[PDB]
Amino acid sequence: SGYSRVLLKLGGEMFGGGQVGLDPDVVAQVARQIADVVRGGVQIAVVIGGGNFFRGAQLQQLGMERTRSDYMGMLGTVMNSLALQDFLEKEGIVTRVQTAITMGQVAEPYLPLRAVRHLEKGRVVIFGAGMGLPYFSTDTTAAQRALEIGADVVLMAKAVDGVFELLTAVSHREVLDRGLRVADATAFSLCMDNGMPILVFNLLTDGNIARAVRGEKIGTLVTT
Amino acid sequence: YSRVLLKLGGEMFGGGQVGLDPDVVAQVARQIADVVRGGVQIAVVIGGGNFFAQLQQLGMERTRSDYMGMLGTVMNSLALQDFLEKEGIVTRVQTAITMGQVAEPYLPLRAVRHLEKGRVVIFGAGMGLPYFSTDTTAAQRALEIGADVVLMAKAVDGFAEDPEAELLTAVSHREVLVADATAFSLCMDNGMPILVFNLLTDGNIARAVRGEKIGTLVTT
Amino acid sequence: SGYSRVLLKLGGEMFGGGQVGLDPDVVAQVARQIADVVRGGVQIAVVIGGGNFFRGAQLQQLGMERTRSDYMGMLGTVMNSLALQDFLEKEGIVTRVQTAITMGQVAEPYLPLRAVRHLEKGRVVIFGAGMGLPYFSTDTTAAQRALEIGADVVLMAKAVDGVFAELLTAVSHREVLDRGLRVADATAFSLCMDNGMPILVFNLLTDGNIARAVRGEKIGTLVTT
Amino acid sequence: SGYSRVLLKLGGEMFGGGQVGLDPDVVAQVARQIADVVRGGVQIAVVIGGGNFFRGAQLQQLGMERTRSDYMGMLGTVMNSLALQDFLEKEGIVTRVQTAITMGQVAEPYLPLRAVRHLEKGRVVIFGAGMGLPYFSTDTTAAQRALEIGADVVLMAKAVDGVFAEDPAELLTAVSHREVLDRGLRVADATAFSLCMDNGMPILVFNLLTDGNIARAVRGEKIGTLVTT
Amino acid sequence: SGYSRVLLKLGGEMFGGGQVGLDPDVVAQVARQIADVVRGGVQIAVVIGGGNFFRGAQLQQLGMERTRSDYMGMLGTVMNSLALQDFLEKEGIVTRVQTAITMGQVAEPYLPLRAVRHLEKGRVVIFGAGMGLPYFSTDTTAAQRALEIGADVVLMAKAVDGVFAEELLTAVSHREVLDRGLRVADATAFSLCMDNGMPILVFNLLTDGNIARAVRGEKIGTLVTT
Amino acid sequence: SGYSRVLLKLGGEMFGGGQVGLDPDVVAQVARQIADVVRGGVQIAVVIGGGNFFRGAQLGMERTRSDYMGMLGTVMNSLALQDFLEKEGIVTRVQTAITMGQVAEPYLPLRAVRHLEKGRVVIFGAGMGLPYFSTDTTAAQRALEIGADVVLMAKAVDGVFAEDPLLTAVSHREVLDRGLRVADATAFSLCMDNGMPILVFNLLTDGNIARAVRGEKIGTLVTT
């Protein structure tokens, strides 16, 4: 009734918590959350964002080149990746980082077949640096990664209960017809065209992933 | 000085607070342009302290912590690269950590070609090995590209003991032994001059390169 | 008066002639037609398609896993990259293939900075394998690649003279949405519209066209801002 | 009499069905037949051909450069690898593709010691891209790969009952490597066959499109043409 | 008018002379004459043998598993390759080594498009580890490597100048070698060259300046053509 | 009361017999001797040297290229021992510090232990994959890596004396004081600072490894 494997997307504020940089109090809670869901037998893969450092869109409006900016952003996601990797291991969770941009000793490259084979071994795969291409967003990276590793659903982890009065379950068509926010613009088209459910839920409420991954009606569940 | 390697701490990008201060980076890029226009070969080594120590205080593995700094120096390096091109300067970034899609790898021979070509080389990722500091990277890179001096660019500008009064200017390596331990011994053992100075005062970088009596000159 | 560097998108049509495999007569007049743009002094980069082999989306309708199908498709575009490379070298054109999927022994990996140098050196960069990610098309490749090497326009090389109303000489990105015209892919178009990349749809099998569009002549359909 | 581990050579035939491209009614039949051997405890390695896309030799006589054309042909074999991986996964079989042209993101490279380990683990190892070398053929990749992973026999999978005499004639049951040379028989390319003969590698030519043969062949039954020295 | 691009095959005995190991007196003489070739405007790529250490077949006959023995042999070739690279750089010659068995730190892998690009840039490519495949010999690697970089001929550098009868042959056909069965080339490697029209020139390189003489087009050694 | 796991260091002489190349009579006697330890339930890791190829002490070549030639030689000796060890019925796993994949798995000290705990013999070749390192330093390093109980400096002539004309136990402080040049400078300082016992013993005398592992009073045990 619930989800077997899932792809968790964590914006940059899930590691900064509204400020800039790393905020170990938030990162530690996130790992606690993911730590329990992994012990429950679920297969969790994580797409880290870079909002707490740079967003190439905000840097080109600043005058900077979009491409330099976009790459600065991705490297930021590789730092958050390592940070999440570190706390997860202090929780007793085996993690594996794979970066879109081939880095050397830092992390392993994007081997999508192996990434799925880590999940079947009960490991946490952390996809860093997004897709490694300027002019794309983390959200779109969560979709492509969720589609390719065969996750049962994408978990848009926000710091807010859901989609707004709140909603308990909508369609992909209704999100566009209603102009509803949350879930990226490009990412949502890629999910809808492929029948990838999106579950927007509050991650900072202690114990939501355990429940959301459990299948309980929480947050907003975009389907079909 | 023929070719110079400029060492910049991470705070030379974040100006006090965390993150980037585009006002600080713009001043640095503006002053580096004047040195390049003066006919000097400049290589820059970037620090990554402006993205956080707090990494050792919270208990991170030493390896992962150092790679977060090396990643940081790449972001500051790409940032400087952007403001240098608005200043009309041609630059090339070489990273010690092979990234390919983001910048070329570190090759000291190639790096020399660039400088001879009038373009600026920006050294990132420090040294692609944990357990090293940025001063050791700046010093170790300067020896490798044959630089004539290492420009330790501080927020001060050159003392006695202050940790109260009184500066200094020009001392011996043997009489010193600030400069970071492994970074200083690596210079002394190879006779590398080190010039500590304040770059955030408009026009000093142009002064130091010509050889004016500014800052502190550390010679053999 | 025209375009400095350009990004040409060649569907699998240009390689199989509408059928499976290679039509070595078609790729040739493509090569010959691309060399005239290069000798004219313009920098050109090409995004190779894989229609003449497999489309990852048409293989799942048939029963196969979508992901493997997509990789078969991206592998196909590499084979076309090599085909186009050969017919271009006999045109006296120095080419450089860059595959999204890292291969090393077959071609370079995608090094976009280095790719821009190749153009500046007068070479033809061939971006094979799409973007090396399943669930993305080559139309989206062409767009993303055009923006990253800073191309001036995406050349959608169709076998027809352009985009009609059932010949449009110039339309806007928003005008195509409100008219729901033929376009050149949904995602690829939104990526070009949102970033202000012009899209010129034109027939390159008609001798001289690519040279005329690159020189700035009013040919085909220009989609701007 | 039963073969412990086998190296099966699948030419482009078994993927295009004689025409260009992918004939899924053919691959599905092939996958169904391999799976029957796997479920019998046999260790199977597969060398995937590329006839259904390009042959470097046939493209050079067409004008293209032989080297550049060979990579086109090797890449094709990787496409067939991913195909056979799919239909073999629908039968329940666990597969592992190893390509001589290192393509990290699409499949692990050629690591023969590991590959033998998969076999030991009951997985099917699919070898794509032949040997990753212009001026070589998939037959030679069967020979070399059979020799290296320690396979007991090279199963040349055809669509004909076996190796005939005179090339239509009668069907031969068992011959020696030197006899194949003395009689003018085309068993599997000269470069590949020489590599087998020089190293005492048995060759068994048989029709696997006939439902059940590969199970009889591995079982040690007198099917097809067995070439031994 | 001679040969523009050449592929020079060096057996393990062009490194160890008498028996096993390295003899810097021989390897220097090889690097000396390779350098005259590069200085003369010719494009050279070298395929290194490893007989001076381990001979794949000769180890399995000893009791060892053949596959291991071929890698042991291939590894030796990488050793020789690193040794020649060094002497060729005391001579002022720029070299790049590519190993068929990927090793990263030791030398870039086999990238055949760079291997040609290096040649076009006037540097010498050293192919080591053979073809990284057991059950193959370096003589075969010389042929395959010569075909993929488009070399004009293979130069089999022997310690005795030419192909005899039991009488030095100055010109024979690929077909004539078999109809005669004439000692040197190697069965597999000879077929691969023959079938593709790859001329093989057996010659002695331990002689004043032969490789230079051969590359210039002079009639030295045994030339085997289509 | 013996040793659980042990790191046997083999000089190049243990494959060449004293001259260049491989002498299969000696390589067999070593493999036959290692078998006696494995059958005794002991966990053995071996570090191989490459002095029997670039024979002598002539390191014209740059030191960098020179070191890699040596390290390559070690891999070749590694494969040799692996082969004769399997003729003994001893399952082995070779790990090289220079990543080769096609030739042998890389060096993962965690992975290596598991090979030891599964009753397999791990052979560490290629020294430490870096120049400016010797085989002795590698042995000491690897013995610390995998938590060995002692390093077994296998000599061809047992005997640590006081004066060139026997000892039986000594101290790390005394070796430095008595002029004895056991093992190697860096390697010895790496062992003394980490309390790694060193046992210099004659490997070629049938039965010495088995009784030295068991804990008999044979050889010169350099204890902490």
Ligand SMILES: O=c1ccn([C@@H]2O[C@H](COP(=O)(O)OP(=O)(O)OP(=O)(O)O)[C@@H](O)[C@H]2O)c(=O)[nH]1
């Ligand atoms: O570089 C690579 C390596 C491996 N892979 C692909 O990832 C998949 C799993 O790769 P793994 O190596 O991690 O799983 P395994 O089957 O080998 O399990 P163990 O024996 O080690 O316990 C394999 O199917 C392989 O084809 C790649 O795609 N690229």
Ligand SMILES: O=c1ccn([C@@H]2O[C@H](COP(=O)(O)OP(=O)(O)OP(=O)(O)O)[C@@H](O)[C@H]2O)c(=O)[nH]1
């Ligand atoms: O890893 C690689 C790198 C390069 N190549 C292929 O080899 C050729 C590149 O060869 P090079 O990289 O060595 O030189 P270059 O052409 O790029 O010229 P400059 O940088 O000096 O300006 C190209 O044809 C490329 O496709 C590979 O196949 N694999």
Ligand SMILES: O=c1ccn([C@@H]2O[C@H](COP(=O)(O)OP(=O)(O)OP(=O)(O)O)[C@@H](O)[C@H]2O)c(=O)[nH]1
């Ligand atoms: O990259 C590699 C990794 C491993 N190998 C070689 O493949 C062989 C086995 O390959 P495996 O690594 O997959 O099995 P294993 O020995 O580790 O045993 P288990 O964990 O499954 O219990 C090993 O002997 C290794 O040396 C390579 O050749 N290349």
Ligand SMILES: O=c1ccn([C@@H]2O[C@H](COP(=O)(O)OP(=O)(O)O)[C@@H](O)[C@H]2O)c(=O)[nH]1
């Ligand atoms: O495929 C990708 C993934 C990430 N990014 C960059 O990474 C930054 C951080 O990601 P994101 O903006 O999604 O952060 P989030 O909002 O999820 O915290 C973005 O601004 C982009 O510039 C990118 O360019 N392409």
Ligand SMILES: O=c1ccn([C@@H]2O[C@H](COP(=O)(O)OP(=O)(O)O)[C@@H](O)[C@H]2O)c(=O)[nH]1
């Ligand atoms: O970035 C890319 C580009 C292509 N493809 C695959 O390759 C096929 C061929 O691309 P395309 O659909 O553009 O074919 P075209 O119309 O260009 O011939 C697609 O169907 C996809 O399955 C892919 O997976 N990713």
Ligand SMILES: O=c1ccn([C@@H]2O[C@H](COP(=O)(O)OP(=O)(O)O)[C@@H](O)[C@H]2O)c(=O)[nH]1
């Ligand atoms: O080691 C190899 C294996 C294959 N090929 C190329 O791949 C094509 C497909 O292989 P093959 O001709 O054996 O196809 P088959 O007859 O097996 O279908 C060949 O024509 C060659 O051009 C190659 O170059 N090297």
Ligand SMILES: O=c1ccn([C@@H]2O[C@H](COP(=O)(O)OP(=O)(O)O)[C@@H](O)[C@H]2O)c(=O)[nH]1
């Ligand atoms: O592609 C190759 C080339 C060589 N070898 C091995 O490496 C040894 C050294 O090559 P060769 O015998 O040709 O050396 P030469 O005596 O010609 O120098 C061979 O005997 C084989 O065991 C191999 O396994 N594969």
